[PDB]
Amino acid sequence: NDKLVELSKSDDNWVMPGKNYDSNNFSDLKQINKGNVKQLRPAWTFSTGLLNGHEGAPLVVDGKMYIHTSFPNNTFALGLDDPGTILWQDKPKQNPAARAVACCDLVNRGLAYWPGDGKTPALILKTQLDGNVAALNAETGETVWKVENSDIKVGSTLTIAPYVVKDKVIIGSSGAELGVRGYLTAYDVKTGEQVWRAYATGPDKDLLLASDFNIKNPHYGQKGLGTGTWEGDAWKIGGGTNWGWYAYDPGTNLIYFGTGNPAPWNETMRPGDNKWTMTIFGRDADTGEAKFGYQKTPHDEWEYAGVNVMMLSEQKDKDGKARKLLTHPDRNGIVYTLDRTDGALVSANKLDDTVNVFKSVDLKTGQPVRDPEYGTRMDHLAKDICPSAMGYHNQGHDSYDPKRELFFMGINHICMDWEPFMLPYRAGQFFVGATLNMYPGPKGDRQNYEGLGQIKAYNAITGDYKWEKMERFAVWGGTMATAGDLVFYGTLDGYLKARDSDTGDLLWKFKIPSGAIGYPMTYTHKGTQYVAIYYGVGGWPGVGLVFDLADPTAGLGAVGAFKKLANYTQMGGGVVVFSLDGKGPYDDPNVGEWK
Amino acid sequence: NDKLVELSKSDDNWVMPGKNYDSNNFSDLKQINKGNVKQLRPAWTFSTGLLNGHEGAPLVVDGKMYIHTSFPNNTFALGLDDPGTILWQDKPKQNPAARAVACCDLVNRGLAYWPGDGKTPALILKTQLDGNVAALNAETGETVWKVENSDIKVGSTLTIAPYVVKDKVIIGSSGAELGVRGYLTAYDVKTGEQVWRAYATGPDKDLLLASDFNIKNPHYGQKGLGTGTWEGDAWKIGGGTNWGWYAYDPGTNLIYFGTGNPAPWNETMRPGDNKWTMTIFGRDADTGEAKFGYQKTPHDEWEYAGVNVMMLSEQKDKDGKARKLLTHPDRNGIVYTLDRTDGALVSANKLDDTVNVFKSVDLKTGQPVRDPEYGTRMDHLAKDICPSAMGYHNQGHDSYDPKRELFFMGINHICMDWEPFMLPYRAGQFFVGATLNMYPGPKGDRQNYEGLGQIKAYNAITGDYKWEKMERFAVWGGTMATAGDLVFYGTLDGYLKARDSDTGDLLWKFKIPSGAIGYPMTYTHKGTQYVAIYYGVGGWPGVGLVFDLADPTAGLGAVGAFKKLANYTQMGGGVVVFSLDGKGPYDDPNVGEWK
Amino acid sequence: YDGTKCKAAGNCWEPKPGFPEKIAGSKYDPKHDPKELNKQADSIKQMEERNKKRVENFKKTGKFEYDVAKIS
Amino acid sequence: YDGTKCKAAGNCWEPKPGFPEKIAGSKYDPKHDPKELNKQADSIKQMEERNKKRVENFKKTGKFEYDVAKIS
Numbered sequence A, B: 001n002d003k004l005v006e007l008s009k010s011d012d013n014w015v016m017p018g019k020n021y022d023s024n025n026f027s028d029l030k031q032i033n034k035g036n037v038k039q040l041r042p043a044w045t046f047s048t049g050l051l052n053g054h055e056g057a058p059l060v061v062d063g064k065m066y067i068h069t070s071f072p073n074n075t076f077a078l079g080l081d082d083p084g085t086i087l088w089q090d091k092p093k094q095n096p097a098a099r100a101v102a103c104c105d106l107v108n109r110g111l112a113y114w115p116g117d118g119k120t121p122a123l124i125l126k127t128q129l130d131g132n133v134a135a136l137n138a139e140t141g142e143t144v145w146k147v148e149n150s151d152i153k154v155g156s157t158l159t160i161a162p163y164v165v166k167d168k169v170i171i172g173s174s175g176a177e178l179g180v181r182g183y184l185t186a187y188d189v190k191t192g193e194q195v196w197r198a199y200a201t202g203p204d205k206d207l208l209l210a211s212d213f214n215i216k217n218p219h220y221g222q223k224g225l226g227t228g229t230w231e232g233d234a235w236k237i238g239g240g241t242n243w244g245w246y247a248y249d250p251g252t253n254l255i256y257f258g259t260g261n262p263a264p265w266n267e268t269m270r271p272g273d274n275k276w277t278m279t280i281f282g283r284d285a286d287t288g289e290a291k292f293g294y295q296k297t298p299h300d301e302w303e304y305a306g307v308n309v310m311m312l313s314e315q316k317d318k319d320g321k322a323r324k325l326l327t328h329p330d331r332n333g334i335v336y337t338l339d340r341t342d343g344a345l346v347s348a349n350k351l352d353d354t355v356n357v358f359k360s361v362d363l364k365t366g367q368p369v370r371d372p373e374y375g376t377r378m379d380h381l382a383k384d385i386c387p388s389a390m391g392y393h394n395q396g397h398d399s400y401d402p403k404r405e406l407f408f409m410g411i412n413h414i415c416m417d418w419e420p421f422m423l424p425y426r427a428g429q430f431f432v433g434a435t436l437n438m439y440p441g442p443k444g445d446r447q448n449y450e451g452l453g454q455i456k457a458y459n460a461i462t463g464d465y466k467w468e469k470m471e472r473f474a475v476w477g478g479t480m481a482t483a484g485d486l487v488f489y490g491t492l493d494g495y496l497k498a499r500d501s502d503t504g505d506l507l508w509k510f511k512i513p514s515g516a517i518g519y520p521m522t523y524t525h526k527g528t529q530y531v532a533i534y535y536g537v538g539g540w541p542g543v544g545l546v547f548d549l550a551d552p553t554a555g556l557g558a559v560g561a562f563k564k565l566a567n568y569t570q571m572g573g574g575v576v577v578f579s580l581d582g583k584g585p586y587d588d589p590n591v592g593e594w595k
Numbered sequence C, D: 001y002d003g004t005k006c007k008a009a010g011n012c013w014e015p016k017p018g019f020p021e022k023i024a025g026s027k028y029d030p031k032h033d034p035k036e037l038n039k040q041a042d043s044i045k046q047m048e049e050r051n052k053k054r055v056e057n058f059k060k061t062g063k064f065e066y067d068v069a070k071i072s
């Protein structure tokens, strides 16, 4: 969408998840920099009135901030000139039954925005846990249109954020833990009319493949694998849902995203590669057809849902060739980097050297070399597998410094024990079939259950890690970087941290109300630069804390892994905005007063 | 308790509700003053993980901060050197049925503290909505003893904060809206053993009166009125519960507090003065016997629950006599000031001149001159009565500047329409019997429903108001004043404000996450002075927002009165701590990190 | 009724124009069931009874037990 | 099974030592009920059907109505 592209070039805007179509989460603003960060302080705050995990980040467009919350997914609009006054609010009424079919806490990654043409006004697009997708009038908040995308009666819910490309909205899908066959849909932003819908498994017809799909990398596989790599109708409940993030290149007109884990978790019941879940896709924005597809984890047996963030860039490869790339830190512990024009593998390195599920990833066959010693299977107990189902990198949205050519990623250091079990499939009921036990990785304190995370600076071409740092808990919600030589990010134990982009030294941090599982964002308003971030621990890692679970194997094993989380934080829900010296709207105490 | 008295003299302590036994809420700390207030910023925050109203204020003793929350009444302990780490937490398991019998939101005014003698360790005393009173080990958080004070099956709950005097704990009571006969109890802080329990209605034996009760003011009334001013057994469900605050004078060894409104609200069903509710009491800490009792609102017909704050002081009266006083801003709109040694009336002025329920308060008969035009009664609709049942002053705990001899009070500007109705009494069910309709007072905007509050500086001897200021909403949770010439207080629309003690000019304010219904408190830690305050709107004024009510007469009429509250705030729950320039524990980003 | 004239010290209630001096047997008679009016009192002397046991036991054993059922 | 040898492009799955090449009729047969396996597909073409009505109506009337029942 060219207004969006234009708008995203503005520093007092943040018009889409990931800031821009490259989704680098990078700001050219250098007002707040490593020289003055130690003066960063809260300018104002806003409680959303809800508990549970608060993922994503707010949007700032045309002097207004749009805030989204966890279930029941409310939407608020604040005037940057007087944030204490809620311009309008949308409070959906949803079937409380949706709560029962949500695997990993009642979260939502964010709102999208469409500029408007003329006949139609600017719109705020949102998704609801219950499956509805709605378009709200950006200025009044009234509903322009609302349609059904996912049906909870079958286990399908929605947590992903919408994505606006040209004049269409892209909606993902969630539910693999309940055997939901994945599919992403494109709607007409103006009317809610369905343009195209592609599935992750089954007949090529449902897959919506371009006639030249993977023509440049025939070994990735091509026609017939949607059913070929499955036994019988198994694919019908094969999973592959996409609930992560997207990236877009106007040049190729391709939408870049990854599909999720196949169902069930029980490896033994899914003989075959399970094309096409766990795969990096290149789809044409308008037609929906896939031009290339590389499967990261053939026949998954760890739940390495391959939906993680896509970050685009342009760099020279080891041959000095300029390449249009896409970097992808997957759940399986490998950071993939492909040519975003034909899908060629450029590099696939381990996030951490403790990764042991794969010996390596053969760049010329594209297949990952499996170390049998760590696979899973019926009637067996696999131990000390890394990464765990939570992966060495999850839902967090990282960032990339175009100048340094460095990706700052929020890593997970968690391994697991695993043993599957048989179970029937009943639409509407969980279809996991595996009991896990997770704990800190080799570099963490396995005794006191701490040292579950890390943050590193990485180069996709060299594969070198400029620097690495250990975090008490997994760095779950992503990072953001500015030209001020800073890298900001929130932590589960309830901090907003800033590190030197070059050395990784911790320069500053603040104690926010609750753990952070979303990414920071920054904007300027009337000359002042602000940094905002949501607070409210939750998501998979906070499951035990949220639903008050004690059994270490509860919450699909997550509970045990974060047993110490409750000594550093409690639930919460809101936004904290920082500015140099806390400068803000109310510096003149009379603004907002009653006269 | 002499250690408490001693401890309260320390600036890095806040050992009891109201700061000290005089309960002036005054700090001699002048680090933060009207000269540098504009630099006050958030040092750190803490979400309590619960929604609903957060009243009271935290305690700070021996380098630790103790935080209390709303139902289910959790307790947290934070180390001032590293607040991000929860030392210990107490999470009570309570019958969810307690929620149904709570008139005004699931709040709790705070924790109390007992120094410990030798055999027994320092204790944190707390009350629970379900009626239990518990003593926790101040350092470990384990339960030392727990006893039943109120039974929810009969409508009696607990929201008041404990009060430690010498070696006993004083527990109030709540439930008049369900016809609960009031009684306060004194327990042995060491064992939980009941020492004495006095009731607010009935036989003098239950009233626990000293043989010389009101000997200095026989006209107040003496023996036999506990039943004499009622018809039949009506007193048995007469109300009079005490859920406000106390004050204590070691000199007189008297505990000062006020009793609540009689039941039901239906004036017609309670013929008689209803001794002894709505009365200011002077009870001996050890024996429990009452040495004086002045009834503020004989035969209440507006629900002017007389439980408001008691603030002691020593001033010269108009005759130049030095007097040991007690000032009491009541719900009925009159600020009473009596001699705290014999209970003599010294002054009784109107909080605001718009008070019309009483023409005046005759100082030599002690009776308030009633203006029939605004009373209530069966088969009639009273209109434009001021103050409303919410009163011109509620549960908020104000403060007093000993140097200026000024009381800074958080006032309510709300009037009401009223009409009672007959109804049976069934233990366990509400027994209100009156339908109200409230709105802004004369000085507010009755059109847009704003201008519901005000804050004033008042002199008890002169009756003069040094200054008055209008607030958008009622100033519900009290104020705190320091030698820095500042008066801090939180607002329902979600600010922490500071005004010049002399002029009342707004010098600074900050936007906290949610409305504030508790009072601010201040302490020093390692030389730095901090100001903390809870956030999380609720209580009676937030009822509509909390339980999502729309009917203006819902929430006992409160709903309509605060219909605009939801445009400025949402629920929340936590603590915000401010310090000059935001200086704090984490100025060195490495403190609290994982190594 | 303006509260100024008192039958006796501390007793100044007067019925409003048109209302009985005693609502007993009047249109406005509550007709309260003494069965109900006494529930609160029993509630307390049971609570006091249990607490008595809890406290005494604590004094005796030095260990506090809340469940009266488990006290001997 | 190390994923290195492939029956064909994009197809490299091999059974682990001791497991069938086809779980059909084996100890590990899911025995999935096709009745169940088809619930999801119907769910979608009903949702698409309703949305079709909602959208078309919106285009027609210029007014959006979510309740299909109220659409004519």
Ligand SMILES: O=C(O)c1cc(C(=O)O)c2c(n1)C(=O)C(=O)c1cc(C(=O)O)[nH]c1-2
Pocket: A055, A103, A104, A105, A107, A158, A159, A160, A173, A174, A175, A176, A177, A241, A242, A243, A260, A261, A303, A305, A389, A390, A394, A395, A538, A539, A540, A541
């Ligand atoms: O298969 C699925 O469709 C699906 C959906 C989601 C979700 O919607 O949030 C998660 C996962 N899987 C998953 O495996 C997991 O790692 C996870 C973590 C979180 C989180 O919000 O922290 N969501 C999800």
Ligand SMILES: O=C(O)c1cc(C(=O)O)c2c(n1)C(=O)C(=O)c1cc(C(=O)O)[nH]c1-2
Pocket: B055, B103, B104, B105, B107, B158, B159, B160, B173, B174, B175, B176, B177, B241, B242, B243, B260, B261, B303, B305, B389, B390, B394, B395, B538, B539, B540, B541
């Ligand atoms: O009669 C009673 O026992 C009783 C109890 C309480 C309470 O416990 O909080 C309130 C009231 N009355 C009352 O009239 C009212 O004004 C009120 C406001 C609030 C509040 O927390 O904001 N509590 C109470």
Ligand SMILES: [Ca+2]
Pocket: A176, A177, A260, A261, A303, A305
């Ligand atoms: Ca999953």
Ligand SMILES: [Ca+2]
Pocket: B176, B177, B260, B261, B303, B305
């Ligand atoms: Ca009351």
